[PDB]
Design an enzyme around this catalytic site. Structure first.
Site, PDB file in Angstrom:
ATOM      1  N   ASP A 189       0.771 -34.531  85.356  1.00 55.78           N
ATOM      2  CA  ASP A 189       1.839 -33.809  85.479  1.00 55.78           C
ATOM      3  C   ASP A 189       2.742 -32.845  84.470  1.00 55.78           C
ATOM      4  OD1 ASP A 189       0.195 -34.468  88.150  1.00 55.78           O
ATOM      5  OD2 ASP A 189       2.224 -35.325  89.205  1.00 55.78           O
TER       6      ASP A 189
ATOM      7  N   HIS B  61       1.599 -38.176  82.481  1.00 58.88           N
ATOM      8  CA  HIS B  61       2.895 -37.322  82.633  1.00 58.88           C
ATOM      9  C   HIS B  61       2.664 -36.981  81.246  1.00 58.88           C
ATOM     10  CE1 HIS B  61       4.192 -39.078  86.310  1.00 58.88           C
ATOM     11  NE2 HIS B  61       4.993 -37.753  87.111  1.00 58.88           N
TER      12      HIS B  61
HETATM   13 ZN   LIG Z   1       5.948 -34.121  89.023  1.00 64.83          ZN
END
Ligand SMILES: [Zn+2]
Ligand SMILES: [Zn+2]
Lengths: 192, 192
Positions: B11, B154
């Site tokens: 992400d 992430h």
């Molecule tokens: Zn996010």
């Protein structure tokens, strides 16, 4: 722990003359599951819808007549889904938060109709093939493939599914897994 | 060579850390889905393309990362639409997958996803790489994945970059491969 993780046992296409025997087997073996009922059968058998609840099951939406939904227009999809919400609620099964498309077949139009009714789409991780003549052994083997969070497709009617219930409970217990509910947020199996 | 597939996802890119991450993934024989914010896709079109050219899939993670359920429907619509436009305009394709910021969703959000042909994708395992997880912990989180399952990571954490080789080793040891996320089921499957 007694439950190190949870799986999503599910049974499509009830309720039916097979339902009470299945519910009795599940409860006797300490299992809970989600019953994806067809609206027409919920309408025809309101007492059996309640029997699912009283057995400790969750009741979910599996369309009214089990059409190939992606072959329908939006209005027809809306009718199928809404009539099933009404039939299950009317029978005492609650207002479902989960919907399984017949045949697992979906599209953006179907997704829009699901969203209108506040339904989360639930496919599956493993198909037990109980609808396609799988043996009791094969069904138990399919359950053995499930990990924490995963959902298995079974059906309300097959005799081999009913016969499998004790060995399903054994398989899960052997693995430290328990039968769980399906999250409307994520569509995966979680603690009840 | 693959007994099953997992869904590696990252992400919040793209970013000054993206190219290093892409190089590590490709050198270790891994593919993943990058859930980009529209504002960062708009700011870094060449890095959007770099993700494609590294063998990754690009997906929608809203424009500015708001708590989407606190927004009105038109605001949700703008966040999602502008991100579709930013990613496609940068050469990342038109996404089929959407991950709500914070995993937070509701029926209104689901309606907007459906309008844009987007399948909602949460996760099965949170690596906690955004929450100062060690490299060891991130690798451990990957080790919990089974066939079909999706892990949240992430684009920016240093320990995530550091983890890539051991992530690849962990998967290879289990005969699991990095897969694509199905728009129909939201499960990891063999790349098309
Ligand atoms: Zn996010
Ligand atoms: Zn069915």
């Amino acid at each position: 722990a007694a439950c190190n993780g949870y799986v999503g046992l599910t049974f499509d296409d009830g309720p039916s003359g097979s339902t009470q025997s299945l519910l009795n087997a599940l409860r006797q073996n300490g299992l809970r599951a989600t019953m994806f009922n067809q609206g027409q059968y919920a309408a025809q058998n309101p007492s059996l819808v309640r029997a699912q609840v009283d057995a400790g099951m969750w009741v979910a939406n599996h369309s009214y007549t089990h059409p190939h939904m992606t072959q329908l227009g939006q209005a027809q999809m809306d009718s199928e889904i809404s009539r099933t919400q009404q039939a299950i609620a009317g029978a005492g099964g609650g207002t479902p938060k989960l919907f399984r498309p017949p045949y697992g077949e979906t599209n953006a139009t179907l997704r829009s109709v699901e969203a209108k009714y506040g339904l989360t789409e639930v496919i599956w991780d493993v198909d037990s093939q109980d609808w396609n003549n799988a043996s009791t052994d094969a069904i138990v083997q399919a359950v053995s493939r499930l990990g924490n969070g995963q959902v298995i497709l079974m059906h309300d009617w097959p005799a081999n599914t009913l016969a499998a219930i004790p060995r399903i409970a054994q398989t899960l217990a052997g693995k430290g897994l328990c039968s769980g509910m399906i999250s409307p947020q994520t569509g995966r199996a979680v603690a009840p």
